[PDB]
C-alpha cells in the first residue's frame, strides 16, 4: 500500500474472520469443563458430588457436535441452568460453612 | 566561524550601492547586523568618503551657503574640503555636516572667476527651471588645462509612500585654449518599493570641442548644450516610457492571443482544433 | 536576530537583487546564525532544468525538489536519481503535464518562450502548487530583463455540490535593461505581490486549470496596468518634478488669474 505511490489513499483496512462465533462456543466448553475441573476438585471436603455429577452430565452431554448457533441461542441458558445448579451448591456451602467454621471451639479445633 | 574582515566588504558594497536617501537609516540597520561601529568604521570610513564623493551629497559652509556637493576638487582626505568659489580650506565632517575652521587657500584662480559667471548663468537656470535641480562648479587647473566642472543633484526624499528619486551629473568645460571641449556625463537613480520594485538608473555621457572666445560665450554655449542635450534626453526617457507600452510590455508580455481577442479554455481541454491538417 | 531579521527585510526591500546571489552571500557572511531559512523570505529567481530520460525542458523549484532532487515532470522523477520518488496523483500529473501543455502554449502566445511549470501536489481535500515562468531578456533586443512568474495556486478544493476554492498568491520578476542611444543606459525593473481569492462551483467544462490560467492571466494584466501606469508614470512624475524644462515667470500669474476665476465662482456660489 505504502510502495505503491498513488494519491491520498483511504484505504483502512478491515479484519474480521469467521471462526470467531465459533471460538465463542468454544470459550464457553473452556469455562466450563475449567469450573468443572474445579468443580471435582472441590467436593471432596458430601452431596454436592452427585450433584455436580449430574449437572454436568445434563449440561456437557446436550452438547450438540457443540455447534455455536445452538450453542448460544439454546446452550446459553443450558449454561445458565449449569450455573444454577452450581450457584445453589455453592451459596449452600458458604452458608453452613460459615456458621460452623465461625464456631470453632479453640485454635486446635480451629485447625 | 566566519572571518569578520569579509563583512568590510560586505557593508563597503552596500554603502556603496545604496541608492540616496536609502543609505544612513539601513547603514544603521547594518550596523545592527553587525553589532560593532569598529568594525563597520574598518573600511566604512572610505566608503564614507568615497560615497560622497561620487553622489554629488549635499553640504553647505556657512560662510557662503551655496549648498556646495561632495566631490573631489575640494576634498583634502582629512575630512577637510575647500570652496570651489572661494578655496576657504575648512574641516567637514561626513556623518553630518559639521563644517569648521574656514582657510582661504592659494591657487592660480584664473577659472575660478570664469566658473563664477558660468555657474551663475547655469546655476541661475537650475535653479529657475528645476525644483532641487542645484548645481556646484568646482574648478581645478591641473595639466596646464582650466577645468570648469558641473555637479547637479536633485531629489526629493519623502518615502512616506516609499519613494525616492535623485538626479546627478557632472559635465566638465575642459578649458583648453584654443579649443575646449564639453565633457559630461549623467546620473539616474530613482526607486519605489511600496509593493513594487523599482529602480531607476540611466545616464549619458558625451563629449564636443569647440574654440574659446571668452566667458560668455562659452558659458552660455556650454550650458546651452547640455541644457539642451538634458531636456533633449529627458524627453527621449518620455518617450522610452512611451516606447515601453507598446514595444516592451509586448516584446515581453503580450496583450492580446494569436486571435487577439480571447481564450477558451475548454477548446484548450479538447476538441484537437486542427493540429494534424498541415 | 530578529532586529536583524527586519534589517535584512528592510535590506532586501531595497538592495537591488539583480545579485540576489551574491547579496545573499553577504547576508549568510554577514549573519550566518540566520542562514536558516533565507529563501524562505528572500525571493530567489528562477532555474532551468532539462531532462534526460526524456529529454525535455522542465523547471527547478521548491515543491518539485525533494531535499535535492528536482521532479521532472516529464518523467515525474527525482533528480539526482533517487529511490524516493514521492509523487503525487498519478492523474492529478497528467493533468499537470496537460495544464502545463496548455500554459505552455499560453507563453507561446504571450510571451514565444521561456517555461511554464506548474509544481503542484494533493492535499487532504485541495492542494497548491507553483506557477513558475522563466523568460529573461531576450537576446533578440538589447534591452532585456530576468521575467520570473512565481505564482502559487492554492485550491480549497471543496466537495459538497461540486464547488471549490481558489486563492492567487503573485510575484513576477523583470528587469529593463534598455540601453538604446535614445535611452543611454536606462534601466528599470522589479516584482510585485498581489493575492486574490474564487469560490467556485467548479464543473467539467471549466476545471481548475482554466480558473488558473484566467485569473492569471487578469492577475498579469492588473499587474501589467499597474507598473505601465503608476509606477512609469510616477518616475516620470519625480523626472519632470525635480527636473522641469517649465520657464517660470508665468504660471504664477496664471494661476494667480485662475484662482480670480475661482473667486468669481465664489462670487456667484
Known sequence: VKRKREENLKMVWRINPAHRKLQARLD?????????????????????????????????????????????????????????????????????????????????EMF | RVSDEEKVRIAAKFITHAPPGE???????????????????????????????????????????????????GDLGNSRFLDPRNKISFKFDHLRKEASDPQPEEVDGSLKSWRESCDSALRAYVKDHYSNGFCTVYAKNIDGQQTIIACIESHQFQPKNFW???????????????????????????????????????????????????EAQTAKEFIKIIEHAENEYQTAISENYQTMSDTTFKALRRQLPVTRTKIDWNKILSYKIGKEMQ | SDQQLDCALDLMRRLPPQQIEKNLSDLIDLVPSLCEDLLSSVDQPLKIARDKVVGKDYLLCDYNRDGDSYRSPWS????????????????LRKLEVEANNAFDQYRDLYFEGGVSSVYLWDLDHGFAGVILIKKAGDGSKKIK????????????????????????????????????????????????????????????????????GRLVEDMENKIRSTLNEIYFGKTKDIVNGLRSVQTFADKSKQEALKNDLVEALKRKQ
Open chain 3, 145 to 212: 530583463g530576468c521575467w520570473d512568474s512565481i505564482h502559487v495556486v492554492e485550491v480549497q478544493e471543496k466537495s459538497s455540490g461540486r464547488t471549490a476554492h481558489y486563492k492567487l498568491t503573485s510575484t513576477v520578476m523583470l528587469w529593463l535593461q534598455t540601453n538604446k542611444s535614445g535611452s543611454g543606459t536606462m534601466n528599470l525593473g522589479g516584482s510585485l505581490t498581489r493575492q486574490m481569492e474564487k469560490d467556485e462551483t467548479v464543473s467539467d467544462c471549466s476545471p481548475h486549470i482554466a480558473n488558473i
Open chain 3, 76 to 91: 515525474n522523477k527525482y533528480d539526482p536519481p533517487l529511490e524516493d520518488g514521492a509523487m503525487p496523483s498519478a492523474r
Open chain 2, 23 to 73: 543609505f544612513n537609516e539601513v547603514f544603521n540597520d547594518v550596523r545592527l547586523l553587525l553589532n560593532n561601529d569598529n568594525l563597520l568604521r574598518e573600511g566604512a570610513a572610505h566608503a564614507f568618503a568615497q560615497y560622497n564623493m561620487d553622489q554629488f551629497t549635499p553640504v553647505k559652509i556657512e560662510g557662503y551657503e551655496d549648498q556646495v556637493l561632495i566631490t573631489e576638487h
Open chain 2, 164 to 214: 525616492n528619486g535623485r538626479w546627478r551629473s557632472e559635465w566638465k568645460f575642459t578649458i583648453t585654449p584654443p579649443t575646449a571641449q564639453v565633457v559630461g556625463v549623467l546620473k539616474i537613480q530613482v526607486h519605489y518599493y511600496e509593493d513594487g520594485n523599482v529602480q531607476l538608473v540611466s545616464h549619458k555621457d558625451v563629449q564636443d570641442s569647440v574654440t574659446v572666445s571668452n
Open chain 1, 28 to 108: 464457553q466448553m473452556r469455562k466450563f469443563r475449567r469450573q468443572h475441573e474445579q468443580l471435582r476438585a472441590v467436593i471432596v471436603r458430601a452431596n454436592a458430588i452427585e450433584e455436580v455429577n449430574l449437572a454436568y452430565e445434563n449440561v456437557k452431554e446436550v452438547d450438540g457436535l457443540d455447534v455455536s448457533k445452538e450453542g448460544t441461542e439454546a446452550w446459553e441458558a443450558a449454561m445458565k441452568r449449569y450455573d444454577e445448579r452450581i450457584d445453589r451448591v455453592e451459596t449452600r456451602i458458604t452458608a453452613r460453612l460459615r456458621d460452623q467454621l465461625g464456631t470453632a471451639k479453640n485454635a486446635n
